[PDB]
Structures are given as structure tokens and as C-alpha cells.
Design an enzyme around this catalytic site. Structure first.
Site, PDB file in Angstrom:
ATOM      1  N   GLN A 236      21.492  22.332  13.368  1.00  0.00           N
ATOM      2  CA  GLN A 236      21.690  22.877  14.702  1.00  0.00           C
ATOM      3  C   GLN A 236      21.261  24.341  14.634  1.00  0.00           C
ATOM      4  OE1 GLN A 236      25.191  21.964  16.928  1.00  0.00           O
ATOM      5  NE2 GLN A 236      24.792  19.766  16.885  1.00  0.00           N
TER       6      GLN A 236
ATOM      7  N   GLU B  67      21.948   9.423  22.061  1.00  0.00           N
ATOM      8  CA  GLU B  67      22.513   8.615  21.004  1.00  0.00           C
ATOM      9  C   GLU B  67      23.318   7.450  21.589  1.00  0.00           C
ATOM     10  OE1 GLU B  67      24.078  10.625  17.630  1.00  0.00           O
ATOM     11  OE2 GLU B  67      23.649  12.621  18.419  1.00  0.00           O
TER      12      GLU B  67
ATOM     13  N   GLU C  43      16.543  15.799  17.533  1.00  0.00           N
ATOM     14  CA  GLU C  43      17.502  15.759  16.430  1.00  0.00           C
ATOM     15  C   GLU C  43      16.770  15.548  15.094  1.00  0.00           C
ATOM     16  OE1 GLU C  43      21.243  13.599  16.884  1.00  0.00           O
ATOM     17  OE2 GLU C  43      21.274  14.048  19.056  1.00  0.00           O
TER      18      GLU C  43
ATOM     19  N   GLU D 113      25.503  21.919  19.952  1.00  0.00           N
ATOM     20  CA  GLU D 113      26.552  21.006  20.437  1.00  0.00           C
ATOM     21  C   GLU D 113      27.894  21.745  20.355  1.00  0.00           C
ATOM     22  OE1 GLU D 113      26.550  17.265  18.287  1.00  0.00           O
ATOM     23  OE2 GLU D 113      27.830  16.269  19.787  1.00  0.00           O
TER      24      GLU D 113
END
Lengths: 490, 490, 490
Positions: A341, A170, A292, A25
Site C-alpha cells: 500500500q 475482490e 493490487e 485502505e
């Protein structure tokens, strides 16, 4: 003494490689420094992307990468990251800068350099139907149009291919605080206007539940299952309460057992969420994706809380090990899994500090385990020793894949930091006799980690504490140890 | 021998002319070649529109035309078809070219040349509220504004009028795969921001059910009936399964009976959909519109499947004949009906091939039947002979309108291709004695059609096989024959 | 003889000043002439805004102003009212002009000149998520971005602060004819993308019910209460049926009692709407706002019906008086209330005609009552005399606030136009003895009003018809009279 049996002939299924996927991200330094350095960075960079890292990740066999995923996905207007780098949109606050030097071309360039698959989240929450529609045109369209011609103008002649297209992320929290029933009809609408251009074939992905929001899953499957190739799931292993999570290093034995237990819980979710899907999708057409997952600790002492910079101890390695073992256990339904991540953010595989970069304990697991990518999963069952404060957890995690080459790999994790795990394995469905090598990742410390000053504190040592008396493989795993084996016939 | 009675004095209702409406999408060659040739085409064209066609359609008394309707409606961003023709937005792919040379001005010009009413579908699915809102400004606004001034800049001084404004199309399938309950609130929102400018009065139209999606109708009426002047219905007569429909010519007697039967089914839909509306709208304020009806066959052997080029046999003519007869039977609720499509696409009235164009069997029906447009519908009842493989279908369809001039027209269709239909008609509510002429469209072949090589294989011959002995009109319709009569008193 | 008691020590709560708020829409002449005259107007103007008015409103202690509110809010695209005044978007009809000379900067300038709080309705119904999102950026963002830099370019260096942000208005009617359940998810989505920049703290406001649409309230609280700081309510006192409301002056005694009764009904609404909220919000976190209240009459005989120009009689003053008294009675939940409208529109405080402007009866009430703004509300209870055609209404309205200075103010309204109201008040919780001044607004006429020819027909005369015998305050309110007192101890 923990016992296992293996039916080397009975293939339970195939471990889709994308399960060893990752996720980046526009956050902390995951995109910037972590990857994108700019073409005239002092760092050794290929077309703006640092070499030291690229090498590692090609070496690690990355199958797929999610971008820009998370919350930024439902904020990013993709047109802000194309065009001349010097006319791309720019945003700054001092409380954190985005120049959008990393946008669409750069990502695709990256995915091709590694050789991985691209996975993209279009903007639902703040974006428009025609916006996301055109993103797909810009990328995959072969003919003449405003968007395709703009791609060409920007330097990429022929259109790229892409399979995985996440419709938002999300959308229950930061992606638009939507009710499940609502997001369904939006997905249905949006996805209608995403086309297979030339012969590019999309693999549409709806944003699924967070943790144990089974309602979300239920609804999505009833309303939208027809219009999706896959469905996302989010679960984070947090040790403590939200407000006080705990540190990545210098933690109590309590915190050890906690983190492990809470990570295991995963299996409960996947299973329950699977049973929902199994109803609305008997034939298991629809992918389960877990875009995630990872540990999550309080950031390091001093760093910006929102920069999410966290270390990576032998604990974090163990975590990954059983997680993948879980996705193995549910590889019938699960087909992709992206750790949070990739770089300088949360349970990262790599952490950087200028031109200096290190591989974490986690990185070694992904490198070690990579041999399971697209390998055929084998029938086993166990008599695993208990461990933890109340015979809480199973002492040993264990998985077994046969790769194309015929060779067979067995991965194992001693959860008990305190003592080695006795294991015996019986081995069935054999033709030739067999030889066997071994590799162990393990640490002296419970919070053994690699720093930039000591980059090799924790790393794969080959392993030989095992006798193979053609039929019974007895061995003594070291404490807090991930371990892999490779066996050839003859 | 089939028997009928007619009460010439009891007017059942009035057949709204718009029932004889048509429909053209940016598809195949319906817009391009079929109509738009460009001002600098060798073809005889008026301001870019081919004369040969215009003649025919004015001759045919077209009341209304739908544009760009279908799926293109929920893709078209109208601003891509205004401004300088050479800077209008452009797309090409060979897997199909849109230059948008035909856009808003051109359509309105067309509707005025013919003299027909314009009916427009704004873009819901991929479009914006403000987009569609402004389309209405651009067109009908008399004053000073960015959009009105842009209209002027573009060459049209004064604003146009328009009544019929479809809010999206086919929002259940290609228009945004929306659930009914969802599309309701969108319609409600969008329609809020469409204004009556100058004195232009809108006639808003919600996208209704596909076939027997009575749910859709139910929902729309409960949620949105207040906010609509009308509601759309889509029904296509397909001979075979979806995947294998069958050809337009060279078909079996099986396929004959099928196509007819499946077309008749219409009545069942309209009736059941009416009863829904009759509940939520006792006083039948709300229009029923049928903006998508017609036969549908596999395209001709060789043409692009998506170019939808299909021929037009005596079968297709019969189809139309009873369909209109059905809309007659439900003219109390139905007020508009648009065949799919007008030119070079599906059951077209006209087909072209360069400057050469022909009129189909279908065309002749619309021309023949046009005398029913806005004519007063008359009370009748029948004793229709049976036909088909199991006395399946009624031998004869029959309708009776009185036009303004007092003259009275009777339309009839022999469904049996195999033999002529005996009919007797008794005639009531008369003062003066009466005379009677007649016209028959019929074919030797079951798949008799007009080609460019033989443009006049199937066409209106005047008809005289009937004795009118002052009270009883006895007559012998030929096989597979549409037929009309005109009667004056005295 | 009406009787009251007052417990000067028991503070019931605090009357949030914003209750004395106002509301201006780009409508009639509320924005144009009414305020914005242009810098080059003959009228005495400060930077384009007329002085005569500004003076009055600073004198009146305006706490907050709503803009552009009403229906225009769900049409306004804010980018049409920024940038160079000579390139701002322009619209004209001849049946009436918007040049957008009044846009975002001008409003903020205004609110700062008065000193009031700004309250803004972003465009939901015709607008986009990213549109409204960016409006917030443009205004409150301290850093570097396209929108913040555009603010700077436009002349405002540092970002403004703003608390109150209405997410749409009137989304049940003109704002997008939305169902309640629908608007909920839109609010949830939109509001997700409105940020607290720098340290600016938003106070988000959902569009609530119209009148007694308790359904709307219920739904919004269940679906969205977590995502809102406040919730709007609209109630208009209309005398007659919609189509024949009645005039602002020259009305019957019937129309007198009507208007009053219908205005009182307010209390019933607030209470029932409170009880809804009290359930879903026991701790009364969420603000109740009443951004649309006022009388509404047929416009003056000859003026454009849509210009909403209506006069302002002693009736209209009474109306306000009890309304505020009601908001007092519900100041535990209510925190803001905005009269419709400010200038030249509906129950206006000010009306203009070129450079000539007058203050209405209403204006005087807000000026008189202003002393209650943020003052501490005092426990009372009464034995109010009856009045009206069937002992319908209570003769006397009464409220009691203690301002910061310690001084205590009592407001009273005789509803009976026909005779003065006998009142006795007992006074408890005293230390010192007390002195007392008084002010009365009242009229000889039932429809006594100020014209431009007689601007001072109806205005605050100081009042002394009351004896204060240390413990009992006896007094005789005049007929149709609003009245205030101020009392100091010692």
C-alpha cells in the site's frame, strides 16, 4: 556482458502515468497517522494531513490514488464518513478503531492537495444500488438535490470531478464470495445507475480476476465488456507458503531469488489475461488495471499481524523496478497500476512513527522512474546475461522512454546482488550528438533498508560508471542496483 | 377494388378494452402541465388536474393508464411522492425539474376522476423488495399498519384497489442492463412479497422483450411463467436509423411508406412472441401486454430532445388504426396495449401550451375506435388491394366488432395517401335487414396536423360515400383515411 | 414375535441433543398467548412469559429453538422488534395482530430461561445484506458501535452468544420463489458479511430442499458447501391431498396407515439427501438439519385456517417416535431437528386456552425420549414383525442409547393399533447383570387426545409387561404404544 539496442525514433507506445499509481485502505496506519493526523495534531499538517508526507508525494509525482479499495470498500457505507466529524459513525474492537474522521470530503481534499486523480471503490457486496448511485450524486452533481445540497451543507460548495469508479473490489473473496457469472450481472445493474453529472465523465472499472483466475476474466469480458471502461487484476509476490511467507529483512539468498522470480511471474498473468481481453476486445478499448500488486511478508516481529506493518529493503526496490518495466512491456493494454500500500502497510513507499517518517527503497524507485510517466515508449531488444541459481532469471531489466521535452531516459536493474552487470547499449535513430547523466539506487546489504534511526542508508546517489563513445554506451551497473539515465541531444 | 366478407354470427373473440390503454412517465410535460397544473393553477383544474383534458379523456373512454412506467419506474422511490406536498423530495438541473407534487395519491385521484384502471411499475433496478412490497401495503391495505396509517395521515382514508402491477420496466436497457435469465429470478423474488390485501386482487406483470428479443420471452416463460399474470412487450415505429429518426411533419413519401411498413412489422413480433408463449402456455393463461408502442420521431425543431415533444400528423393516426387492428387480430392472447405517451410526449393524443390544449389526429382514432372496447370480434377475410412502391403494403386495413347493444362497427384505413380505396363487403349470418351510418377521419395533407393556431385541421367528419344494397355494402374510402361505421338491424 | 439383538459395547455414534429441537413462528398463537402473555397478563408469567409452559419445557429438556423461522423469517425486519416496547412497530388486520412486543431481547431472554440454544433465520428474501449483517453485530459484538451500543441502550449490557444462524428459510416458496442455483450466490454473498465477534463462533445454515427436491441439495453442495456449516430440510407428513388433508382426530383406519407410511418416507429422503452430501462432503463436515418436520392436518372445525390450530392424538405421538428413531439411524450426518410447531400451531407439544394449557401426546414422547439427547447410539439389528394392510409397515420401531451415567435406554413404538407387539431382545457386551424399569405412553383410542376438560387422557404410565431373564428380555408392547426402558448394571 549484457547487450541492448535502441531505436530512438520507433515509438512503441505511451506509458500512461496512472501506471505509477498507489492504493490506501482503512487498514493498519495507512489512512490514520500515515496521512490523516487531524487538524490539531502536533505533526505539521495541512487541514489534517501531514506535510512531511505530502511534500514527498508531490515530489514523487503521484498520478492517482485508490480508496478505500481492498475489502473495506465492500464494507464502507460512505454516509458513515460525511457530515459533521463529531456525528460520523464510530467503530472499535480490541483484538483497531475507525472514527471515520477520514471520509469523502477529506479524501477529495487530499487528492487535490497532492494534485492526483481520485479512484474510488463503491460498496457492492454489503451495499445497495441506490447507495452507490447516490455517492456519485453527492460528489459530482451540480444542481439541486438532497445529496448535492448535503454536500454543500457539509462545506464543499461546487461538486468535485472524478473519472475512475471501481464497482466493488475482490468480490471473489472478501467482497461477497461471488461466482464470476454472478458478479457480472450485479456490475451490469449497479453501473446502470451511475451518471455523468454536469459534464463529469465516469470511467467505470469492474473487479477482475485474482492471480490466475482466467475463468473470471473470460466471463466478465463476455457478459459485461460493453458496460466497462476498465477491469482490475490482483497479484501479490509472496516468498514462501501463505502460512510462512518469510521476513522483509534478514532472509536467505534462496528467499532473494524466490521473491524476484515470483514477482516476474506477473508478466505471464498480464499476457494471458491480455489474450483473453484481446479476443473479446480486439480494439483494446477496455483498460487493464492492476489495482493490487506488491511484495507481502510476515509483519515485523511484534506488530499486529493485521496492521500489516512491513519493512522495505533493496529487494523490494528491485521488485518494483522490473514490475513497472513489465507494465511498460504491456502499456498497449495496461493503463493503471496501484502498489499495495502507500503508508505503514505492506510494500509501502513511506513509513511513519509519530512525526518521524522515512522514504523506503521503493519510494526512490517511483521518484527515479517517475520520468517514464506519460513518456513515449521506445523499441528495444536485448541479449541479457543470465543469473540466479540455474541461469534462472535475466541479469538485467531495461526500459527506455522519451519524455515530452525530447530528453530520453533509460532505467535498469541488476538482479544479481553478487556482482555488477556489464552492459553495452547501441543507440539508433539519432540526429544530434548526445550527453548523458546517471542516477543509481543500490545497497551494500541484500536487505539494506532505511530505519527511523538511519533514514538514508539506501537512497539515490548519482552514477558515473559508464563511457558514452557517441554510439555505444558501455557501463558497469553495481550489484543489486536500480539505475536511471537522462540524455539530451547536442 | 378491395373485397371483404363478414360472418356476423361467428364471434372470433372479445377485444379486451384495456387494449385502448395509455402511458404517462415523469418526462417532458406529460405529467406536469399536461395533467398536473397544481390546485392553485389559473387553469380550470379539479384538485390539481386540468379540466379541458379530463373532459376529453372521459369522452375518449380511457380504460387503463400506466405510471410512472418507462425508465423513471426503475428510478422512482415512491416515498418521495407522498406526504406533505411541500416536504416531498425535490430535484432540479438545467442540462428538468421534479418536485414530486405528482405522486401516489394524485395518480389514484386521477384514475378515479377519469374512471380508468391504474397500472403501476414498481422500482426493481435501483429499488428494494421491501420498498415495492410496502408500496402495495400503503395503497391496498385496509387494516392498521405504519404504511396504511401513513396513507390515512396523507388524506386518503380507505385503501384503493389496483389490479395491474408491473414489476420494473425495460430491465434490459435503462432498468438495470440485466440479462433475461437474471431478471427472471428477481421477478420471482420481488413478486413473492406482493400481497392481496382486504380483497384486492393483483395482476402481476413481468417486463418482457424489446422488439425481437425472442430469447428474453423464451427465458421468462420457462423460468417465471408460473409467477406471472402477464408479460410486457415494447415496439416503437421509428422511420429512420436510431440516431436520425426523421421529423413528425415535413417528410418525404419515402418516409410515409417506411413508417407504415415498420408499424405493420408489429404483427410479425406479436405472432412470433405468441408462438413462444403458446408453447410454454398452451391454455393462454398469461396476458400479453404491449405497454410501450407508438411512433417516435426526432423532437420538434428547438425543443429539448429529452422533453420528447413531438407533433402528430394524419400519418400517426393511420399508424394507430392498423396497430389496434393488429391487436384485434391477436386479441386471443393480447389483453392490454398502452400508447407512448398520453400528453406532450411522443405520439401523444393531447398536446398543451398553457391553458390551450388540442386533440391530435391520434386522439380521434382512439375516440372513433373506442366502440371496439370489450366488443365481440367477428370472423372476416379479405381480398385487399395492394399499394405502396412495389405493391408493398395492403391498401386497406379492416376490423369488425359487435358491441353489447347488438350494433356492429367496422373500422377501415386507406393506407394509400394518393387515391381512395374501393371496397365491397358481403355480410352473412343475418336475420333482419340493416341500416348503417359512418364517420371518417382524413386529411388533405400527408402531414396534416392540428396546431394551437389551427386546432381543427384534422378531425372526424361524418361519412356517407357508401351504398348499402341489402347484402352488399360498396364504398369508396377517401385517401389517407381512417373510417368507422355503425350498423343496426331492422 | 419380533426379534432384536443389541451390542451394548459397539457405539454406532452419538445422538446430538439438538435433534430434539423445536420451532416457533409469529403465527396463530405460537408466540402470542402460547408464550408471550405480557408482564401484566393475569396468567402466571415470568417477565411476560407464561410459567405453566416454561416449567413444562425445562422439564422436557429443550436443547434448541428456531425463531422466527418459516416464512415470517423472510419477512421479519428485526429492528421492528427492539427498542422501547411502546415504540416497536405495530400491524393489525381484522379477518390478527403483531405488536412486536416479542422481539430480539425477549427471544434471547426466553432461550436463557429454558436454558436452550437460540437458532435464528435472518431475512434474505425481503431483507438486505447489511440488515442481517447488523443483526449479528447487535447481538454478539463486544466492542463499541451504533448497533452494539443500541443493544446496551435497550437493556442488555454484554453481547449474547449464538451458534446457529439460518440464512433465510423456504427460499423456494414463500421466502422468494428462488431457483436453487440463484439462492446459492445470495447465501454466498450474505454469509460473507456475518462475523465471529469477540470469540462468538457462528454455525451458518443454508436453506435446503423441500421434500424430494434433490436438485436443490445437489446444487447447494456444489456451489456453496465451503461456505456453510449446515443445510436445512423440510418434510411434512400430510395424510390426504393438499386441499383435503384430513382431521387430527375422528379419522379412518385408512388415515391411520397413511399418516404413518408418509411419515416413514422421511428415512428415504434423509438417506438420498445424505448420499448427495456424502459425495460433495465425504468427511461429513456439513450438518444436516431438519428445521421443519411434523404432521399437518386441516385445522380444527371453526378455527382460522391460517391460525393452524390443530389437535394432537396418539397418532401424532407415534409419528414423532419413529421420526426420532430415524434421526438416530442417521445421527452420523443429522445433528438437529425442529418440530413444527411448539405451541397452538400444527403438531404442537403444548396447546393453550387462556391460563389453561395441556401437554399433548407428542409432548410426552419428547419428555420420555429426552434420555437419548447426547447419549451414545448402540449397534442393533432386528427381525421386526410386519403390520398394516399389506404387511406394509414394520410392526415395531426400536432405538438404544447409552447416556453419560452409564445407564442404557431403549425406546419402542408399536405401530399396530390393533394388537400388542411380541418382542424378544438379546443383549451383548455386558459386564454386570442388569435391572430394568419402563415407561409406556399409549391410548385406548386411535385418536386419543388431551382436551382442556380432560388434560390427562393420554400420558406416561410406568410399564412392567416384560420378563428379563439375564440375557433375553421378552416383552409385550401394548397396541399403539410408545415405550421406553432404563437399565442399570448390577
Amino acid at each position: 556482458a549484457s547487450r541492448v539496442v535502441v531505436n530512438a525514433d520507433r515509438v512503441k507506445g505511451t506509458i500512461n502515468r496512472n501506471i505509477y499509481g498507489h492504493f490506501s485502505e482503512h487498514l493498519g496506519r495507512c489512512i490514520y497517522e500515515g496521512l490523516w493526523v487531524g487538524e490539531d495534531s502536533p505533526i505539521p499538517n495541512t487541514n489534517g494531513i501531514r506535510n512531511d508526507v505530502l511534500e514527498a508525494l508531490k515530489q514523487m509525482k503521484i498520478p492517482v490514488l485508490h480508496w478505500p479499495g481492498g475489502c473495506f470498500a465492500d464494507e464502507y457505507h460512505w454516509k458513515d464518513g460525511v457530515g459533521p466529524r463529531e456525528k460520523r459513525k464510530r467503530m472499535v474492537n480490541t483484538h483497531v478503531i475507525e472514527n471515520n474522521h477520514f471520509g469523502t470530503h477529506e479524501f477529495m481534499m487530499l487528492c487535490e492537495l497532492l494534485g492526483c486523480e481520485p479512484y474510488i471503490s463503491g460498496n457492492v457486496g454489503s451495499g445497495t444500488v441506490q447507495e452507490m448511485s447516490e455517492w456519485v450524486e453527492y460528489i459530482t452533481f451540480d444542481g439541486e438535490s438532497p445529496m448535492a445540497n448535503w454536500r454543500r451543507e457539509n462545506g464543499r460548495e461546487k461538486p468535485w470531478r472524478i473519472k475512475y469508479w471501481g464497482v466493488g473490489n475482490e468480490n471473489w473473496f472478501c467482497g461477497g464470495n461471488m461466482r464470476a457469472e454472478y458478479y457480472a450481472d450485479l456490475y451490469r445493474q449497479f453501473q446502470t445507475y451511475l451518471r455523468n453529472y454536469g459534464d463529469n465523465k465516469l470511467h467505470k472499472i469492474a473487479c477482475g480476476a485474482n492471480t490466475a483466475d482466467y475463468h473470471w476474466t473470460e466471463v466478465l469480458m463476455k457478459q459485461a465488456a460493453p458496460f466497462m471502461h476498465g477491469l482490475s487484476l490482483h497479484y501479490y509476490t509472496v516468498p514462501g507458503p501463505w502460512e510462512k511467507k518469510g521476513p522483509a529483512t534478514g532472509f536467505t539468498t534462496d528467499e532473494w531469488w524466490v521473491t524476484l522470480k515470483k514477482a516476474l511471474f506477473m508478466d505471464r498473468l498480464v499476457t494471458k489475461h491480455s489474450a483473453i481481453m484481446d479476443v473479446y476486445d480486439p480494439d483494446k478499448r477496455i483498460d487493464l488495471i492492476v489495482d493490487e500488486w506488491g511484495t507481502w511478508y510476515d509483519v515485523e516481529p511484534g506488530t499486529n499481524p493485521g496492521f500489516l506493518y512491513q519493512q522495505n529493503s533493496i529487494r523490494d526496490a528491485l521488485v518494483a523496478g522490473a514490475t513497472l518495466h513489465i507494465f511498460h512491456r504491456h502499456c498497449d493494454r495496461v493503463r493503471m497500476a496501484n502498489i499495495a500500500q502507500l503508508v505503514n502497510v505492506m510494500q509501502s513507499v513511506i513509513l511513519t512513527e509519530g512525526e518521524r517518517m522515512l522514504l523506503t527503497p521503493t519510494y526512490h524507485v517511483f521518484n527515479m522512474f517517475k520520468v517514464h510517466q506519460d513518456a513515449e515508449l521506445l523499441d528495444t531488444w536485448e541479449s541479457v546475461e543470465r543469473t540466479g541459481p540455474e541461469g534462472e532469471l535475466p541479469k538485467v531489466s531495461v526500459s527506455a522512454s522519451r519524455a515530452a521535452d525530447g530528453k530520453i531516459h533509460i532505467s535498469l536493474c541488476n538482479l544479481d546482488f553478487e556482482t555488477g552487470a556489464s552492459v553495452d547499449i547501441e543507440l539508433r535513430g539519432l540526429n544530434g550528438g548526445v550527453s548523458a547523466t546517471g542516477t543509481t539506487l543500490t545497497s551494500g546489504r541484500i536487505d539494506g533498508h532505511n530505519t527511523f534511526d538511519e533514514p538514508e542508508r539506501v537512497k539515490p546517489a548519482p552514477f558515473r560508471d559508464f563511457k558514452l563513445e557517441g554510439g555505444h554506451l558501455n557501463a558497469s551497473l553495481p550489484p543489486m542496483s536500480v539505475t536511471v539515465l537522462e540524455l539530451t541531444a547536442g
